Amino acid sequence: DKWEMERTDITMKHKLEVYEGVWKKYSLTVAVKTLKEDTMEVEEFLKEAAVMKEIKHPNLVQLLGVCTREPPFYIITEFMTYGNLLDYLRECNRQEVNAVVLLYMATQISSAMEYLEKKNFIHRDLAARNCLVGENHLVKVADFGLSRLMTGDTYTAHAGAKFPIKWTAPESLAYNKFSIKSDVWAFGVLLWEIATYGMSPYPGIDLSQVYELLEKDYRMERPEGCPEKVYELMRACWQWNPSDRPSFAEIHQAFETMFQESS
Ligand SMILES: *Cc1cc(-c2c[nH]c3ncc(-c4cncc(C(=O)N(C)C)c4)cc23)ccc1B(O)O
């Protein structure tokens, strides 16, 4: 198992229980995520790390190694120096992180989602807080809660599971069923987060009323300064019927076209 390594190969630097660390064998700064106890919620996290071994895409966080033998367990991934995309957008220089850059970030994210689409994976938590930013506006999707679709189209979460309401497709709120189309819905909210430089979705809306509003065809308004053909994509992601939402292949193509069309 080339992915297994000994904890003495990593030196812990600063807490972020996720740590900034150094893989001393390559002098490479890494992110280390550690698990104290041996609980069943921990074991599901490490079974998701096994899924990370099959994934390799420039815009997905790369797995580097694991410490499965005995606790505390280590998950080692590449380090993104600028942290999560949500805080990044809220604190950035909007003259530097301008509309072209926002377009660039959406193209990167949709490229990774198209990759997961063709390998029949689902993310289940697509949001700005789960995207990591590197140098020169490089964006990578945090792929730690990925699920593999072993048979069929739909994954069903265990009854009683709590989801982020304002990012969750209506099929998942009502029936706890997730698909790549539910990721397309969450991607629409992610677009709205990017276009607003990190505003909270459905501002001021009571969480208990969100689903009923969605049933009655309420959607978020177009953000100020958002191009109309991006808001059209947003609204396409928020179709009621999952089969009426576009694929990530169509979305990446649309964003590649718009991104090249900027000078
Ligand atoms: C499992 C996991 C991984 C990570 C993570 C993976 N790679 C990273 N690189 C950089 C960061 C990071 C660095 N500096 C700041 C921040 C930040 O946004 N805050 C301190 C608010 C992030 C993180 C990572 C992160 C989290 C998790 B997890 O699911 O607990």
Q: What is the DSSP string of the chain?
A: -TTB--GGGEEEEEE--EEEEEETTTTEEEEEEEE-S--HHHHHHHHHHHHHTT---TTBPPEEEEE-SSSSEEEEEE--TT-BHHHHHHHS-TTTS-HHHHHHHHHHHHHHHHHHHHTTEE-S--SGGGEEE-GGG-EEE--SS-EE--SSS-EEPPTT----GGGS-HHHHHH-EE-HHHHHHHHHHHHHHHHTTSPPSSTT--GGGHHHHHHTT--PPPPTT--HHHHHHHHHHT-SSGGGSPPHHHHHHHHHHHHHT--
Nearest CA residue ID for atom 10, ligand 1: 80
Task: Please report, in range form, the residues annotated as the binding site.
Answer: 16-18, 33, 78-84
- 17 CA: nearest ligand 1 atom: 30
Which positions are annotated as active-site residues? 125
Q: What are phi and psi of 93, to 5 degrees?
A: -80, 105
The residue extents of the domains of the chain are 7-78, 85-260
Regarding the beta carbon of 132 and ligand 1, being less than 6 Å apart is answered: yes
Q: Which atom of ligand 1 is nearest to the CA of 33?
A: 1
CATH topology of domain 85-260: Transferase(Phosphotransferase); domain 1 (1.10.510)
Ligand 1 centroid to Cα of residue 74, in Å, is 14
- Rounded to the nearest angstrom, the distance between the alpha carbon of 209 and the centre of ligand 1 is 32
Q: How far is CA 214 from CA 96, 120, 170, in A?
A: 35, 27, 8
Report CA-CA distances (Å) from 111 to 17, 115, 215. 29, 6, 30
* CB 16 near ligand 1, within 6 Å: yes
Binding site as annotated, residues for ATP = 16-18, 33, 78-84
Q: How far is the CA of 229 from the centre of ligand 1 (A)?
A: 32
31 in contact with ligand 1, CB cutoff 6 A: yes
Elucidated via:
X-ray
* Spacing, Cα 76 to ligand 1 middle (Å): 11
**Resolution of the coordinates in A?**
2.7
* Ligand 1 in reach of 34 Cβ (< 6 A): no
192 CB under 6 A from ligand 1? Answer: no
Amino acid 21 reads: G
Distance CA 101, CA 99 (A): 5
For 7-78, give the CATH class.
alpha beta
